[PDB]
């Protein structure tokens, strides 16, 4: 997160950290007791290595009572995802066991109605991704509220030149943005999960390159079927 603040400890119980060999890789969001939703291209990095997910955390290095590392039983990437595109960039991870729920660990309701967030709406994004251009990585959870951008504006040649399909949404990226390491994370609007931070190479904080997020409502059928 760029231009953001530190998040209130354990105020987003659904926040997950997807890890590769004890190191944070991407963000993730608990959507069910045994399922965490993230981005597919995150596994492209975990080619060689063990994938685990950390729940109930705030600081990635310090001991916390609610902290728990879960192993991954299976990783289900969306079937139409390609290692060379930003479409269907979702991944579902089944934890080795159901997550122990508490005030610091709880699933987040997600959007099933396929309706665009009104533009200007402020949504919350969080992650342990880099905080500046030097590539600095926070130890604790960061976040930032970002306004949603109408699609027509995100599509202009000056922005993402019609790369935005109905299955994607954008939020402003001026000084405040999600960056590397935040991929796979939550974009919450009105207490509900509206999107997931995509996992593609993109410059951060440049208002001419809005943040791209995958709309979960557009994938309600795939999720329902994977969690069935």
Coordinates of C-alpha atoms in Angstrom, one line a residue:
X1 CA 0.0 0.0 0.0
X2 CA 1.3 3.4 -1.1
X3 CA 0.1 6.6 0.7
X4 CA -1.7 4.6 3.3
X5 CA -1.7 4.3 7.0
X6 CA -1.2 1.4 9.4
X7 CA -4.4 -0.5 9.9
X8 CA -6.1 -0.9 13.3
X9 CA -4.9 -4.2 14.7
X10 CA -7.2 -7.1 13.7
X11 CA -9.9 -4.8 12.5
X12 CA -10.1 -6.7 9.2
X13 CA -10.4 -10.3 10.5
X14 CA -10.7 -11.6 6.9
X15 CA -7.2 -10.4 6.0
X16 CA -5.0 -13.3 5.0
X17 CA -1.3 -13.4 4.0
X18 CA -0.5 -16.0 1.4
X19 CA 3.1 -17.2 2.0
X20 CA 5.8 -19.0 0.1
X21 CA 8.5 -20.6 2.3
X22 CA 7.7 -18.5 5.4
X23 CA 7.7 -15.2 3.4
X24 CA 4.7 -13.0 2.5
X25 CA 3.8 -13.3 -1.2
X26 CA 0.3 -11.9 -1.8
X27 CA -2.7 -10.9 0.2
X28 CA -5.8 -13.1 0.4
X29 CA -9.3 -12.9 1.9
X30 CA -11.1 -15.6 3.9
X31 CA -14.4 -16.1 2.2
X32 CA -15.4 -19.3 4.0
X33 CA -14.1 -21.2 7.0
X34 CA -11.8 -23.3 4.9
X35 CA -11.3 -21.1 1.9
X36 CA -9.2 -18.2 1.1
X37 CA -9.6 -16.2 -2.1
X38 CA -6.5 -14.7 -3.8
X39 CA -5.0 -14.0 -7.3
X40 CA -3.9 -16.8 -9.6
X41 CA -0.6 -15.3 -10.8
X42 CA 0.5 -15.4 -7.1
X43 CA 1.1 -19.1 -7.6
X44 CA 3.2 -18.4 -10.6
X45 CA 5.8 -17.3 -8.0
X46 CA 5.3 -20.2 -5.7
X47 CA 6.3 -22.5 -8.5
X48 CA 8.9 -24.1 -6.3
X49 CA 8.0 -23.8 -2.6
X50 CA 5.4 -24.6 0.1
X51 CA 2.2 -22.5 0.2
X52 CA 0.7 -21.6 3.5
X53 CA -1.7 -18.9 4.7
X54 CA -1.4 -16.7 7.7
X55 CA -4.6 -15.6 9.4
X56 CA -5.3 -13.6 12.5
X57 CA -2.2 -11.5 12.0
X58 CA -1.2 -7.8 12.0
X59 CA 2.6 -8.0 12.2
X60 CA 4.2 -10.7 10.0
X61 CA 7.2 -11.2 12.4
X62 CA 5.9 -10.8 15.9
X63 CA 3.9 -13.4 18.0
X64 CA 0.2 -12.7 18.4
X65 CA -2.4 -15.0 20.2
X66 CA -4.7 -14.9 17.2
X67 CA -2.0 -15.6 14.7
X68 CA -2.2 -19.0 12.9
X69 CA -0.4 -20.5 9.9
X70 CA -2.5 -22.9 7.9
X71 CA -1.2 -25.3 5.3
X72 CA -2.9 -25.5 1.9
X73 CA -4.8 -28.7 0.8
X74 CA -5.4 -27.7 -2.8
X75 CA -5.0 -24.6 -4.9
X76 CA -7.7 -24.0 -7.5
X77 CA -6.8 -21.2 -10.1
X78 CA -9.6 -20.0 -12.3
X79 CA -9.7 -22.2 -15.4
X80 CA -9.6 -19.4 -18.0
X81 CA -6.6 -17.7 -16.4
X82 CA -3.4 -17.3 -18.5
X83 CA 0.1 -16.6 -17.3
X84 CA 0.1 -13.7 -19.7
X85 CA -3.1 -11.7 -18.9
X86 CA -5.1 -10.0 -16.1
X87 CA -8.4 -11.8 -16.8
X88 CA -9.8 -14.4 -14.4
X89 CA -7.0 -13.7 -12.0
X90 CA -8.6 -15.5 -9.1
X91 CA -7.3 -18.4 -7.0
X92 CA -9.0 -20.4 -4.3
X93 CA -7.0 -22.0 -1.6
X94 CA -8.4 -24.8 0.6
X95 CA -6.9 -24.7 4.0
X96 CA -5.7 -28.1 5.5
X97 CA -8.4 -27.5 8.1
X98 CA -11.2 -25.2 8.9
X99 CA -10.0 -21.9 10.4
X100 CA -10.5 -21.4 14.1
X101 CA -12.8 -18.4 14.1
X102 CA -12.7 -15.5 16.6
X103 CA -12.7 -11.7 16.7
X104 CA -9.4 -11.6 14.9
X105 CA -10.4 -14.3 12.3
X106 CA -13.7 -14.2 10.5
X107 CA -14.9 -14.6 6.8
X108 CA -15.9 -11.5 4.9
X109 CA -19.3 -11.5 3.0
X110 CA -18.8 -11.1 -0.8
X111 CA -20.8 -9.5 -3.6
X112 CA -23.2 -11.8 -5.6
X113 CA -25.2 -9.1 -7.4
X114 CA -23.5 -8.2 -10.6
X115 CA -23.8 -4.4 -10.2
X116 CA -21.0 -1.8 -10.5
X117 CA -20.0 0.1 -7.5
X118 CA -21.1 3.7 -8.0
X119 CA -18.1 5.8 -8.9
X120 CA -16.7 7.9 -6.1
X121 CA -17.6 5.3 -3.6
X122 CA -14.7 4.9 -1.2
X123 CA -13.5 1.4 -0.8
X124 CA -10.9 -0.1 1.6
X125 CA -7.9 -2.1 0.3
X126 CA -5.3 -3.6 2.6
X127 CA -2.0 -5.5 2.3
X128 CA 1.5 -6.0 3.5
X129 CA 2.8 -5.0 0.0
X130 CA 5.5 -2.5 -0.6
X131 CA 5.1 1.0 0.8
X132 CA 7.4 3.1 -1.5
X133 CA 9.3 3.0 -4.8
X134 CA 12.4 1.7 -3.1
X135 CA 10.5 -1.5 -2.5
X136 CA 10.2 -1.2 1.2
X137 CA 7.9 -3.9 2.8
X138 CA 5.9 -3.2 6.0
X139 CA 5.9 -5.7 8.9
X140 CA 2.4 -4.8 9.9
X141 CA -0.9 -4.4 8.0
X142 CA -1.5 -1.3 6.0
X143 CA -4.5 0.0 4.3
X144 CA -6.0 3.0 2.4
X145 CA -9.5 4.1 1.3
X146 CA -9.6 4.6 -2.5
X147 CA -12.4 6.0 -4.7
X148 CA -13.9 3.8 -7.4
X149 CA -13.5 5.1 -10.9
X150 CA -16.3 4.7 -13.5
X151 CA -15.3 2.2 -16.2
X152 CA -15.5 4.5 -19.2
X153 CA -12.8 6.6 -17.6
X154 CA -10.5 3.7 -16.9
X155 CA -10.8 2.6 -20.5
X156 CA -9.5 5.7 -22.2
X157 CA -6.2 5.5 -24.1
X158 CA -4.7 7.8 -21.6
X159 CA -5.5 5.2 -18.8
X160 CA -5.8 1.5 -19.5
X161 CA -6.9 1.8 -23.2
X162 CA -10.0 -0.5 -23.1
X163 CA -8.2 -3.2 -21.1
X164 CA -11.1 -3.1 -18.6
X165 CA -13.8 -5.7 -19.2
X166 CA -17.1 -5.9 -17.3
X167 CA -15.4 -8.3 -15.0
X168 CA -12.9 -5.7 -13.8
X169 CA -13.2 -2.4 -11.9
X170 CA -10.8 0.4 -11.1
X171 CA -10.1 2.7 -8.2
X172 CA -8.1 5.9 -8.2
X173 CA -4.3 5.6 -8.0
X174 CA -3.2 9.2 -7.3
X175 CA -0.6 9.1 -4.5
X176 CA -2.7 6.4 -2.8
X177 CA -2.6 2.9 -4.4
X178 CA -2.1 -0.8 -3.9
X179 CA 1.3 -2.1 -5.1
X180 CA 3.4 -5.2 -5.4
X181 CA 2.7 -7.6 -2.6
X182 CA -0.9 -6.4 -2.2
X183 CA -2.1 -8.6 -5.1
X184 CA -4.7 -11.0 -4.2
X185 CA -6.0 -8.7 -1.5
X186 CA -9.5 -7.3 -0.6
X187 CA -11.3 -4.3 -2.0
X188 CA -14.1 -3.8 0.5
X189 CA -16.9 -1.4 -0.2
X190 CA -19.8 -1.0 2.3
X191 CA -18.7 -3.9 4.4
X192 CA -18.6 -6.3 1.5
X193 CA -15.9 -7.7 -0.8
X194 CA -16.3 -6.1 -4.2
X195 CA -13.0 -7.0 -5.6
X196 CA -9.6 -8.6 -5.5
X197 CA -6.4 -6.7 -6.3
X198 CA -5.0 -8.1 -9.5
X199 CA -1.5 -9.6 -9.7
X200 CA 0.1 -8.0 -12.7
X201 CA 3.1 -5.8 -13.1
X202 CA 1.9 -2.2 -12.8
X203 CA 3.5 1.1 -11.6
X204 CA 2.0 2.4 -8.4
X205 CA 0.7 5.8 -7.4
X206 CA 0.4 7.2 -10.9
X207 CA -3.0 8.7 -11.5
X208 CA -2.8 7.9 -15.2
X209 CA -2.7 4.1 -14.4
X210 CA -5.7 3.3 -12.1
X211 CA -5.7 0.3 -9.9
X212 CA -7.3 -2.7 -11.5
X213 CA -9.4 -5.1 -9.4
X214 CA -11.3 -8.3 -10.4
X215 CA -15.0 -8.1 -9.6
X216 CA -16.0 -11.1 -7.5
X217 CA -19.7 -10.8 -8.4
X218 CA -18.7 -11.7 -12.0
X219 CA -17.3 -15.0 -10.6
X220 CA -20.1 -15.9 -8.2
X221 CA -20.8 -19.1 -10.1
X222 CA -17.2 -20.3 -10.1
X223 CA -16.8 -19.7 -6.4
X224 CA -20.0 -21.3 -5.5
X225 CA -19.0 -24.3 -7.5
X226 CA -15.5 -24.6 -6.1
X227 CA -16.8 -24.3 -2.5
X228 CA -19.6 -26.8 -3.2

